[PDB]
Write an enzyme that holds these catalytic residues in place. Structure first.
Site, PDB file in Angstrom:
ATOM      1  N   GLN B  11      37.400  39.109  43.445  1.00 14.90           N
ATOM      2  CA  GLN B  11      37.071  38.148  42.786  1.00 14.90           C
ATOM      3  C   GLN B  11      38.273  37.511  41.881  1.00 14.90           C
ATOM      4  OE1 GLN B  11      37.054  37.997  39.231  1.00 14.90           O
ATOM      5  NE2 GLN B  11      38.073  39.533  38.679  1.00 14.90           N
ATOM      6  N   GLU B 245      58.458  29.481  59.600  1.00 18.91           N
ATOM      7  CA  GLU B 245      59.796  29.440  59.151  1.00 18.91           C
ATOM      8  C   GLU B 245      59.954  30.339  58.259  1.00 18.91           C
ATOM      9  OE1 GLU B 245      61.241  27.949  56.196  1.00 18.91           O
ATOM     10  OE2 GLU B 245      63.230  28.193  57.008  1.00 18.91           O
TER      11      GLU B 245
HETATM   12  N1  LIG Z   1      45.897  35.614  37.822  1.00 18.79           N
HETATM   13  C1  LIG Z   1      44.496  35.916  38.045  1.00 18.79           C
HETATM   14  N2  LIG Z   1      44.059  37.401  37.975  1.00 18.79           N
HETATM   15  C2  LIG Z   1      42.978  37.818  37.929  1.00 18.79           C
HETATM   16  C3  LIG Z   1      41.981  36.633  38.091  1.00 18.79           C
HETATM   17  N3  LIG Z   1      41.047  37.420  38.042  1.00 18.79           N
HETATM   18  C4  LIG Z   1      40.941  38.677  38.066  1.00 18.79           C
HETATM   19  N4  LIG Z   1      42.388  38.907  38.166  1.00 18.79           N
HETATM   20  C5  LIG Z   1      42.941  40.345  37.891  1.00 18.79           C
HETATM   21  O1  LIG Z   1      42.136  41.104  38.756  1.00 18.79           O
HETATM   22  C6  LIG Z   1      41.987  42.221  38.225  1.00 18.79           C
HETATM   23  C7  LIG Z   1      40.526  42.917  38.529  1.00 18.79           C
HETATM   24  O2  LIG Z   1      40.944  43.136  40.010  1.00 18.79           O
HETATM   25  P1  LIG Z   1      39.697  42.469  40.974  1.00 18.79           P
HETATM   26  O3  LIG Z   1      40.319  42.684  42.643  1.00 18.79           O
HETATM   27  O4  LIG Z   1      39.511  41.079  40.843  1.00 18.79           O
HETATM   28  O5  LIG Z   1      38.411  43.318  40.860  1.00 18.79           O
HETATM   29  P2  LIG Z   1      37.281  43.086  41.949  1.00 18.79           P
HETATM   30  O6  LIG Z   1      37.572  41.953  42.740  1.00 18.79           O
HETATM   31  O7  LIG Z   1      36.049  42.774  41.061  1.00 18.79           O
HETATM   32  O8  LIG Z   1      37.157  44.371  42.656  1.00 18.79           O
HETATM   33  P3  LIG Z   1      35.646  45.261  42.921  1.00 18.79           P
HETATM   34  O9  LIG Z   1      35.425  45.465  41.280  1.00 18.79           O
HETATM   35  O10 LIG Z   1      35.534  46.231  43.693  1.00 18.79           O
HETATM   36  O11 LIG Z   1      34.521  44.156  43.272  1.00 18.79           O
HETATM   37  C8  LIG Z   1      42.119  41.747  36.714  1.00 18.79           C
HETATM   38  O12 LIG Z   1      42.674  42.996  36.039  1.00 18.79           O
HETATM   39  C9  LIG Z   1      42.888  40.886  36.405  1.00 18.79           C
HETATM   40  O13 LIG Z   1      44.311  41.177  36.091  1.00 18.79           O
HETATM   41  C10 LIG Z   1      42.413  35.132  38.154  1.00 18.79           C
HETATM   42  O14 LIG Z   1      41.474  34.531  37.903  1.00 18.79           O
HETATM   43  N5  LIG Z   1      43.728  35.136  37.968  1.00 18.79           N
HETATM   44 MG   LIG Z   2      34.649  42.133  42.620  1.00 23.54          MG
END
Ligand SMILES: Nc1nc2c(ncn2[C@@H]2O[C@H](COP(=O)(O)OP(=O)(O)OP(=O)(O)O)[C@@H](O)[C@H]2O)c(=O)[nH]1
Ligand SMILES: [Mg+2]
Ligand SMILES: Nc1nc2c(ncn2[C@@H]2O[C@H](COP(=O)(O)OP(=O)(O)OP(=O)(O)O)[C@@H](O)[C@H]2O)c(=O)[nH]1
Ligand SMILES: Nc1nc2c(ncn2[C@@H]2O[C@H](COP(=O)(O)OP(=O)(O)O)[C@@H](O)[C@H]2O)c(=O)[nH]1
Ligand SMILES: Nc1nc2c(ncn2[C@@H]2O[C@H](COP(=O)(O)OP(=O)(O)O)[C@@H](O)[C@H]2O)c(=O)[nH]1
Lengths: 427, 430, 48, 426, 429
Positions: B11, B245
């Site tokens: 996400q 590149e």
């Molecule tokens: N820079 C940035 N970081 C984000 C954003 N959204 C989430 N994060 C980071 O992602 C972390 C959470 O990990 P994710 O991979 O997004 O969690 P997930 O995709 O819901 O993984 P699942 O719970 O297994 O579904 C948070 O601690 C944030 O720091 C965003 O929109 N921008």
């Molecule tokens: Mg997720």
């Protein structure tokens, strides 16, 4: 009936070779459409050097443009004077080497170099007498270095009695445009020594201070940089396409400037470089040409000619000139400072006069210098290549495509051979 | 014709994917309906008459973030079949995203990629976006990354990964997931451009001077970095660079492929008029540590390989003049074995301005993407955090239930010992 | 019912075989792959 | 006065000759309504070769349309220039062969050959000095493959001294169009050996290769391939319909291209095919025509001519062209490529010029080459038959209609006989 | 004149035919009352002053499905006595439609075939529509195809037969009815096209994203395939394929005449906007196994013969490139004695779209009919179901009392036993 084939390689080659075709088309007098619109009848005397007759009087250049990236030919056709090239000569790739010599020379070149020697051969026996080939490519890049030097090696095998010009651009001394420049420069030099009959070196910072300090322009762009690159190459072939008092063909530029077959690398300099705000104060006389021609600042290579002597010098004068003042100025500079010339060749300087000047200008010259000061350009790249290789840096990209470090050891072995023999003849 | 297929997992990737594809439609002029009122062809495939669909897949096990795009402002933009959802999320568990849930969705995920591969003639590479601290960002991407490498040989991959900051993070098992994801991206991902969540908070507070930012605001300047590096592929330039590149230019050794990121002009609309935005000022701001997208002090480390992505009205001399000035500065230090350290990629298009965004319309911009030896400070703190976590085997019983075994924790830890020791010896003078 | 290219726009091989008309300085631009190579954007400016 | 009777066979034949008369009548200046609108008297100078004068100035071709299904009858009637044909030449069936060579030759071809043979007898008697008969058909189908080859055997017995020009498309190697192509081709070639005076091999995938690479067409349609065939069909009869500095009709070519009676299959091509992008930049001269003449990419056969030696070759240049410049470049290509021309016939290449070119073009040339490389097509077609015949699949359709399996056994034996004869001369 | 007569037998025949002539009248501009507001002669015979009637008969033993057409919107299209009814149902009894009540109804059928054959100038073939699991389709179809074989010799008879699925059989005595039908169809029908009702269910669920399909939505997809195979007659093309072209070029052996079915683009209205439907993409979808209209897996078998019917604005330049790209793929396999496995047919008209139908407007379409060695999987499976039922004589007492004695079960078992031995040897390398 002497025909010159122009070959451009890579991003730098297709962009700055376009502007060489800009100035020749502007000087021979052909429009962007392709028809003749010159004033005099002297231009139509030798068109066959660079152009082919076709239907409707159109003149198509004897140029093959070739690279691994499709982005350049988007820029080549879209620019001015870009329609004139034949599309059959517009052979390109789909992957792109991406500043790697290994992909251009061995992996992604192998499916395309067989194609480009079909295009070159079609324009080979189309004309009557091949004088040779000229190529203008890059050494810091990879799509014109590896893909280019393989073409340069292949055409010497097929056509060994013809002559090679390599207007190769080297990495700048103080700044670098690419990180992996010392690898692709030294691997290109190792191939260009035994295959290219002569080489002329251009350097961007040598163009940078010229376009600022001498041309007095605040912000020259790359087009301003390529113009002096385009202007010098038209001065190479000025005596071919036009009459003159004394004619120097391109074989003369080889047999005269090169004492030994390995010692063929040159430096170039365009003589009448005055600004718009300083032109009318300056008197256009051949003493003013010869003082600028022999100046250290006017050279378009990274070397400084006060460090090393000239083994052989040349001058390609264009226009209506009194040859006594031309002769006695070169005699004077040979007599003013005999230390700065190599002593064991008497009368080092060659002059030839083309009777017609370029457009606008009335008196011009093109200096060709086989100076031993250009070993500093070799040595600074050579010390960069040794330092990069001794930690095997950036090497898994190269050896992963079909390379081993045996050539890299061999490439250095010819690289430091050049600086050793250039220093040997200076003493 | 060249094309690039962006991949977003997790996400964090989707919200970045919402922000990054927002600019691509805006810069090329695509309305949210998906119509034009060949520049699009590197990102958008033409379908029928005057229509563009993104060459991207949004695969995620959490359905709430995926269908938000399905109900957002870009309903008719994305292909609904390219947006792949999951019934239950991995929920910060690398085991759930790799073995149990991931296996029944990667068969459908690779099918869409195969359908995407035949549409494009010459595929230039893949841009992968994921959060290493998340469950599906670590788990589903790792299963996806190894499947792409065995399917499409040697094709370039760009790891635009979001790492948790050693000082600020929002989950307790992000050290577990980042360690386990790092075990997979070393052997597969060609270039791993790093991004820090807390570092760009400091950029919004200080340089962009907005005192209350949100993740929509934070993703935009990240998305401005993504477009700047690929605009050379998108648009003509004096010295163009490509996706292909970049890997052989910034990765000298096969297991050191981590890049720090910096975007030079970060000023507001009211600040834009008063700043004398200039080529020397932006390049000097690029090497300034607070402009980094990753929380690093590059004085502690050293710059091994660097890269300059210039956009806008940039003449050739001053970008070369800025090369010389940085090398004269003793504040910025380079390692002694890479004298040629700069790649200059100049693009003729000024960056677009997003409507309602905090960034202002500027003429010249620099996107610094540089490898450095200060990256080991991030991995040392993550390893130090991992050592305390695994000292008493807390939060381990979740992983062993869903397919994974105990020994995979030690092997992934063993690689980060090898990665950290490789960073020190390369930066060591010899 | 009409074939594909009768509704695409290019009809027959008369122009490209008998070599009448011209792609440049003309109207017909619908046939040749070199002609539909679009290419990147153009930012023209004369040399200084 | 050296007239040619055209026979068009089946789906491929009726579509090929639809565009063929669509081009030749435009070359002679004939409007869709069959009248005359030209400007030079040379166009009307020799029209007896292809057309018949009718009451009111109407010009009807000597083309007999013969097929087994009435689908192609409306296809040629409703097409462009589709009404110029006489209605008594529309001899057609109702059941259709269905890619069954036995059905076109034995069962339903018997009640249609006796009808088409009356029409050919009608057209041949009305004309004075028959130069020969031209037939166009396919080798992968059933209507033009079976009933077309049955017409050849009947017309050879009636006119043994006249010349048969067999225009055939061969099944493509890399792409397959019908499953029963080995059965159809190996049978149809066998009767072409003893009956046809000469055969002119065409191939679809070579025509697709020419359009995509040489002409650079983004979309080559089904008629664009047909148009390139008609440009070479009109080139064989260049000297017949028009004056020339060096004349070469059908019989002068046949005696100079057929060294042995069973080696009468030719590979052909058209020279001045330039793309629209490269249209302006080509200096149209004799060296350009020659360097495109012997290019292997310009050939219209599946066999690469570099593989096998050229036995004999023919060139039919068209235009106001220098006779020395033709001859001094025939010698250039023979000497520069010595291994590709057979040694025991000196001076393989035969050249001729016709003074008037096709419309809009200034210099043009058509090619005929009798090469030993065409066994690669012959061997490949035969080996698909042998793999088919040893399993006896797709044969119960053939053997249920009046062929015992032994009649197939002379088919590969003769097919292996020609690949034995092509083998010894290379 | 290109003229074909289609017969519809059984309950599945009427419902498929109702969706068939719905698409056929819309293709040719015929209004439901039959009034046109030159190519209609393939299926419609012009009657009197500007009205066209179908060249079909809707014969069945259920009167409920026949008069539904009579009471429906097509009361003015079909002829009254060409819709043949019956007093009593066969009711899942193969012996009833063959000996008990099939005898008194086949005489009225043959009279209407003779009247329809004399009306048509040159007959091109027969199209049959049935489900072999039912009593009327298996029973009367055994008797009807027997009579047309004697009456109309060496004439093509196209079979579009629906078979019971592996997972689902909506009737209990279907293994008896399907095996005993294959005894008759082996010698008489020239080309049989296998269909399974539950493979079309998988196509509708995934491709057309309809979670709740019915029999009408299934029959819309069937009508598109039958129209695509016969569009070569009604409209011209670069490569047009007659039904007589079809049988001789796809049937290698007399006892192997069962065919697979595939239609490549199955896209709803919402997905049609975004999908780039070109020839190279759809030819991969045609050979994709989930798009196959029967539940035999072509990876297990080897493709023996294959016919491609291309509809819409299909250029012939890429169909040669598209076929060759399929042959380079390793998963698609061919038998060793048939290197030439393709028959490509190109038609210029796009497939029509019915108002309210699930299918959307598509520029170019592909109909693929192939012969494969994987057909032994659907025949050995139904052999196992019939052999298990015949172990202790289940549902045999219904069949024995209705004329068909016990020998026909052993005789049809031995016929399919030779058929199972026939597929294993034709695939042998
Ligand atoms: N820079 C940035 N970081 C984000 C954003 N959204 C989430 N994060 C980071 O992602 C972390 C959470 O990990 P994710 O991979 O997004 O969690 P997930 O995709 O819901 O993984 P699942 O719970 O297994 O579904 C948070 O601690 C944030 O720091 C965003 O929109 N921008
Ligand atoms: Mg997720
Ligand atoms: N293709 C298709 N098959 C159908 C349809 N409706 C029913 N079927 C199939 O037909 C089978 C039922 O057997 P039928 O042959 O229709 O039964 P019948 O025709 O009424 O024969 P009797 O009941 O003996 O009179 C079911 O198992 C279905 O698989 C339909 O609308 N389309
Ligand atoms: N004068 C000039 N030099 C150029 C230009 N583009 C590139 N170069 C030189 O070429 C080198 C980089 O070339 P590159 O694009 O990597 O070549 P390629 O990728 O192999 O085709 C630099 O050192 C530049 O000095 C140009 O437009 N003008
Ligand atoms: N060049 C060319 N080839 C054709 C044409 N029509 C059919 N063919 C080829 O003929 C072969 C099949 O011929 P077919 O249609 O069966 O002829 P039929 O026996 O009369 O039905 C295929 O390989 C086609 O490629 C045409 O108009 N031009």
């Amino acid at each position: 009936m002497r025909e010159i084939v122009h070959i451009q390689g890579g991003q730098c080659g297709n962009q700055i070779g376009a502007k060489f075709w800009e100035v020749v088309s502007d000087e021979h007098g052909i429009d962007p459409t392709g028809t003749y619109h010159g004033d005099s009848d002297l231009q139509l005397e030798r068109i066959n050097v660079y152009f082919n007759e076709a239907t409707g009087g159109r003149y198509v250049p004897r140029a093959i443009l070739m690279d691994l990236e499709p982005g350049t030919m988007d820029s080549v056709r879209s620019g001015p004077y870009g329609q004139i090239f034949r599309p059959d000569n517009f052979v390109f790739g789909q992957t792109g080497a991406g500043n790697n010599w290994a992909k251009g020379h061995y992996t992604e070149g192998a499916e395309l170099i067989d194609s480009v020697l079909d295009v070159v051969r079609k324009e080979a026996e189309s004309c009557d007498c091949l004088q040779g080939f000229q190529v203008c490519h890059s050494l810091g890049g990879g799509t014109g270095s590896g893909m280019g030097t393989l073409l340069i090696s292949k055409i010497r095998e097929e056509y060994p009695d013809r002559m090679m010009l390599t207007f190769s651009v080297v990495p700048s001394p103080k700044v670098s445009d690419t990180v992996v420049e010392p690898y692709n420069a030294t691997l290109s030099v190792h191939q260009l020594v035994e295959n290219a009959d002569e080489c002329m070196v251009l350097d961007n910072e040598a163009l940078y201070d010229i376009c600022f300090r001498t041309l007095k322009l605040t912000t020259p762009t790359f087009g301003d940089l390529n113009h002096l690159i385009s202007a010098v190459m038209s001065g190479i072939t000025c005596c071919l396409r036009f009459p003159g008092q004394l004619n120097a063909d391109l074989r003369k530029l080889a047999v005269n400037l090169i004492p030994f077959p390995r010692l063929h690398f040159f430096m170039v300099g365009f003589t009448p470089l005055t600004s718009r705000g300083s032109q009318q104060y300056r008197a256009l006389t051949v003493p003013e040409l010869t003082q600028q021609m022999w100046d250290a600042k006017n050279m378009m290579c990274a070397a400084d000619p006060r460090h090393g002597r000239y083994l052989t010098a040349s001058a390609l004068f264009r226009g209506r000139m009194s040859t006594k003042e031309v002769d006695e100025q070169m005699l004077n500079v040979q007599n003013k400072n005999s230390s700065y010339f190599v002593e064991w060749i008497p009368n080092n300087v060659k002059s030839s006069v083309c009777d017609i000047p370029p457009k606008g200008l009335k008196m011009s010259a093109t200096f060709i210098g086989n100076s031993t000061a250009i070993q500093e350009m070799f040595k600074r790249v050579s010390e960069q290549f040794t330092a990069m290789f001794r930690r095997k840096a950036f090497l898994h990209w190269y050896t992963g495509e079909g390379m081993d470090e045996m050539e890299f050891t061999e490439a250095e072995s010819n690289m430091n051979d050049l600086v050793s023999e250039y220093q040997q003849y200076q003493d | 014709m060249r094309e690039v297929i962006s991949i977003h997992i997790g996400q964090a990737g989707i919200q970045v994917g919402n922000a990054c594809w927002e600019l691509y439609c805006l810069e090329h002029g695509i309305q949210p309906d998906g119509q034009m009122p060949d520049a699009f062809n590197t990102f958008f495939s033409e379908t029928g008459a005057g229509k563009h669909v993104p060459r991207c897949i949004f695969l995620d096990l959490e359905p709430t973030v995926v269908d938000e795009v399905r109900t957002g402002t870009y309903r008719q933009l994305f292909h609904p079949e390219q947006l792949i959802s999951g019934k239950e999320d991995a929920a910060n568990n690398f085991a759930r995203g790799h073995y149990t849930i991931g296996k029944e969705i990667v068969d459908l995920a690779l099918d869409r990629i195969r359908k995407l591969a035949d549409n494009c003639t010459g595929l230039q590479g893949f841009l992968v976006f994921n959060a290493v601290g998340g469950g599906t960002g670590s788990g589903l991407g790792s299963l996806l990354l190894e499947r792409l490498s065995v399917d499409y040989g040697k094709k370039s991959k760009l790891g635009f990964t979001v790492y948790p900051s050693p000082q600020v993070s929002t989950a307790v098992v992000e050290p577990y997931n980042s360690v386990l994801s790092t075990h997979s991206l070393l052997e597969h991902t060609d270039v791993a451009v790093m991004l820090d969540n807390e570092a760009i908070y400091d950029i919004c507070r200080r340089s962009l001077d907005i005192e209350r930012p949100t993740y929509t605001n934070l993703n935009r300047l990240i998305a401005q970095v993504i477009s700047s590096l690929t605009a050379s592929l998108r648009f003509d330039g004096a010295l163009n660079v490509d996706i292909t590149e970049f890997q052989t230019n910034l990765v000298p050794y096969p297991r050191i492929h981590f890049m720090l990121s910096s975007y030079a002009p970060i000023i507001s609309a009211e600040k834009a008029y008063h700043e004398q935005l200039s080529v020397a000022e932006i390049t000097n701001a690029a090497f300034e540590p607070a402009s980094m997208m990753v929380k690093c002090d590059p004085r502690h480390g050293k710059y091994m390989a660097c890269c300059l992505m210039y956009r806008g009205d940039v003449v050739p001399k001053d970008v070369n003049a800025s090369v010389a000035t940085i090398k004269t500065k003793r504040t910025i230090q380079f390692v002694d074995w890479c004298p040629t350290g700069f790649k200059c990629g100049i693009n003729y298009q000024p960056p677009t301005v997003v409507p309602g965004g905090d960034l202002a319309k500027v003429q010249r911009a620099v996107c610094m993407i540089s490898n450095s030896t200060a990256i080991g400070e991030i991995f040392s703190r993550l390893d130090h955090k991992f050592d305390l976590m695994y000292a008493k085997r807390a939060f381990v019983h979740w992983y062993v239930g869903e397919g994974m075994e105990e020994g995979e924790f030690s092997e992934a830890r063993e690689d980060l010992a090898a990665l950290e020791k490789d960073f020190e010896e390369v930066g060591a003078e010899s | 019912v009409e074939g594909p290219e009768m509704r695409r726009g290019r009809q027959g091989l008369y122009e490209t075989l008998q070599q009448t008309s011209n792609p440049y300085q003309g109207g017909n631009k619908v046939g040749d792959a070199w002609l539909e190579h679009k290419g990147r954007k153009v930012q023209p400016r004369p040399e200084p």
